[PDB]
């Protein structure tokens, strides 16, 4: 992971100050599971506390993400998609 | 049992002793800090008694004590002494410690460097009263003390400032440390060159070594950290539903909100009491340091102190005071033996059956002849009746050698 | 970002809605109120020093110093030995009125230094100086059980839990 | 109003000071003395 | 932060959506990385 | 010190009149009309406030006692080095050269009357580090060389008493070619007559 996964903890603005906060963060230099879209691939992963998603691509293969408990018509599910018009 | 080491040579060493004299005169308002712009918390706070008056008075007492500390350490002179426009000090150079006219603050390069080295806001209920004596005024006091010690020696401390040439004052100080004044006069150029070299080196050391002013930086940091923690404790719930008073007052009815407001009020009162206690202890430590600094200014700057290591390592010659933010830096000029030589030694000289003991200094033998020299400098002199006194005979003193005591009257 | 915070947990800036601009929030002026008084015997006339606050906002004689502003004391230019400590090098009664002036550090004198001249006292004065030092304080004793719990057992039982 | 009342040895109120009348009266009230000595005295807090 | 939405429902599973390139599907050469947030 | 102790005691007794959030400051009065389940919590609040006030008073007394101990240690050192003996340290026992001091008892304190010597009626003199005589440099054994404008004299630095330069109040070291600022004068040898 190197030094990635840091996000602004809040909408609070701070200038030239060091701030210490305890939130859900991706640990530095941690092992991150990486997958290649091409097969010579989108497995279903658990969500747990949070997910840091990194994308290295040029043709925008990764268009969206799906979140939920059962991932089927049985239960309510969250769906973010990019249909080349807008994020829905 | 018969060997001695006499310093044939010496050196002049200038050492800085940095002592805090005062802390920032912080003042808290218990009512505003604990109960912010609300009547409801104020009514409950009034049920806790005179805690806010006691805390405010304690902080006022520490602030007055800081002013008294600065006044005691620096204002030891009835008059403001001015250095002569011509720096004819017999080769001694005080440019690094005398105030510089070109600078827009009448501060010497050394104190200006000290101010530049140490590096340091509006809060709710918290204010910093300015010091009674300004930095410029404290620097003027230090300059007056420095002019007084440079021109009148230690006389200005005792009473009226009596002018005395600086080489002659240095000779008196050398006599004060047990070295005959002729040693300075024979080595005035060497001593002046050493003094200037040490004065340059000490400014270089202050400019090059960090943490030299760390004692002064530490008290400023401790005061700032205590203030920062006290402000940070405003955001602590202390078991209340929310830290901010307005939210708990707005979302809860007063019959139930009173217990939450009480939890916040007691927590803030306890935090302020802890901060005041920490400040009181820190002020006591600062007062002890200021009392030590005042004593050091009285005995090392206003006078020559025979207390060992009280005014710097080595035989103390003099001290130069320098102002610093919330502190004083003492430049102790001291005499240190440099080159040591062995000498065969006898407690007394046996002449014609009589035992002679040195009036001052010790007997020395370079290996062929015996001589009488001062202990702190090797200046051998022929044994005579004017520098030695006769006591008893040679059959009582243990470990004595025979020699000829030249009587000046005899030839 | 919608609002900014200082190094401490206090809000320094906000993003104002309805205009999308940044407004700095400064705690509005407050300060202690000190009263310069020469003493009831000397005069009933007193001056008010508002501490650490500008006084372009709340007026017969106003003098602004780093310690806040003094009202009712006139500022003179000639310095004097400090009579009342105000702060920031300022001190304050003369000519039946309260005056404010920069402190005078003492009588400025230059010693006539010369490389071949010495001043030697032809006489002396034997002075006596009084130094007062406290050596002890009242030996006050307070009994907790009587002080916090007056002549009652149940408060003593509650105290024993402490 | 807050009032500082001077009781004589017989309990008669011989004098009074109104703490809100003027800054000198506030100084007398804060020191709890009808007579104040020379010096600075913090009596209140100005808050806008 | 780019989106904040009051969804209100628990999320225990996550699945990414990929753009399948028609030749029978051959996805583009890309790398997607998943890192789990920890307290 | 007396006022601070009395003021601390006055605050401590006045703190009893505070409620600390109780229905009343009087312990028995709230105890007499409240049942033990709710009287206990009211008494607990009163005890917490009063105990905190007592702890604060004890802490303030401890700090004041430490300051009084520091003052007493300084007073003991002054009694030893100013009254029991003579102190050479400047300003420890009063302005001026310290001659002696007298202790006086006082309520909770001691007053030291420091008897000190202060120079006065000083006069200008032309000074010289050394005197050249017969090719030899003479330095004052004790005191300094001073000229009133016609003659040179040796005098103690702290009091003007002119004495003729002789071989017993001056010592010879080196030659006149090494001393800076040396002057020429006659050293009256007592053996010469
Ligand atoms: C004494 O030491 C200094 C500095 O080391 C030197 O300059 C001087 O020549 C020495 N003098 C003698 C007499 O050795
Ligand atoms: C003292 O040293 C400084 C170093 O910059 C020099 O400028 C000054 O001329 C010196 N003073 C004398 C009297 O030589
Ligand atoms: C002479 O002095 C030197 C140091 O300068 C020392 O090492 C040596 O032991 C001494 N010898 C005697 C006999 O004093
Ligand atoms: C010792 O002193 C004598 C007399 O000053 C001198 O002649 C001799 O050369 C010296 N000897 C040594 C070993 O230094
Ligand atoms: C020193 O001790 C030696 C024995 O090691 C002895 O011969 C000599 O007399 C002693 N000298 C003195 C001055 O005591
Ligand atoms: C010194 O002289 C005495 C007699 O005057 C003699 O007994 C003694 O041995 C001599 N000592 C030395 C060290 O020459
Ligand atoms: C105080 O008021 C003066 C005059 O308007 C102004 O120049 C100055 O900046 C003000 N200072 C502060 C701290 O508000
Ligand atoms: C010294 O001063 C005293 C007064 O303090 C005076 O009585 C005395 O005559 C003076 N003596 C001389 C020598 O001036
Ligand atoms: C107080 O009452 C007594 C009666 O014993 C009377 O003598 C005195 O004058 C009264 N003093 C005052 C001040 O009222
Ligand atoms: C010494 O002379 C100078 C100038 O002539 C003068 O300023 C000073 O007051 C004189 N001091 C005494 C003690 O006479
Ligand atoms: C200096 O003192 C000597 C002492 O004999 C005296 O003769 C002479 O007149 C004095 N001169 C002045 C100027 O006082
Ligand atoms: C003092 O300085 C002057 C020049 O200002 C010089 O003529 C005189 O010789 C010097 N005297 C001494 C004692 O240094
Ligand atoms: C003192 O006398 C020597 C010659 O004896 C002479 O060279 C020198 O200039 C004289 N110095 C003074 C101060 O008169």
Residue numbers in the entry:
A (entry chain A): 31 to 70, 80 to 127
B (entry chain A): 709 to 828, 853 to 1143
C (entry chain B): 563 to 620, 639 to 672, 687 to 756
D (entry chain B): 273 to 320
E (entry chain A): 225 to 247, 257 to 272
F (entry chain B): 951 to 1143
Give verbatim excerpts from the published study on this entry.
The spike protein of the SARS-CoV-2 binds to human angiotensin-converting enzyme 2 (ACE2) through the receptor-binding domain (RBD) and changes the conformation to fuse the viral and cell membranes, mediating viral entry. Here, we used a structure-guided strategy to engineer an inhibitor peptide with mutation-tolerant and potent binding ability against all SARS-CoV-2 variants. We named the peptide CeSPIACE (COVID-19 eliminative Short-Peptide Inhibiting ACE2 binding).
We determined the cryo-EM structures of CeSPIACE complexed with spike ectodomain trimers whose RBDs were BA.2 or BA.5-type. The EM map showed that CeSPIACE binds to each RBD of the trimer, forcing three RBDs into an open conformation, although in the prefusion state, the trimer is predominantly in a single RBD open conformation. Two spike trimers formed a head-to-head complex mediated by CeSPIACE involving several docking modes. A typical docking complex occurred when the CeSPIACE-RBD binding restricted the orientation of a head-to-head complex, thereby twisting the overall architecture and distorting the trimer symmetry. Conformational restriction induced by dimer-mediated binding at two sites created a wider space between the third pair of the opposing RBDs, and two peptide dimers and an additional peptide filled the resulting space (arrow). The crystal structures and peak retention time in gel filtration indicated that CeSPIACE certainly dimerized in physiologic solutions, but the cryo-EM structures suggested that CeSPIACE has stacking properties that allow it to dock two spikes. Head-to-head complexes similar to the cryo-EM structures would form on the viral envelope, implying that CeSPIACE can bridge separate spikes to aggregate viral particles.
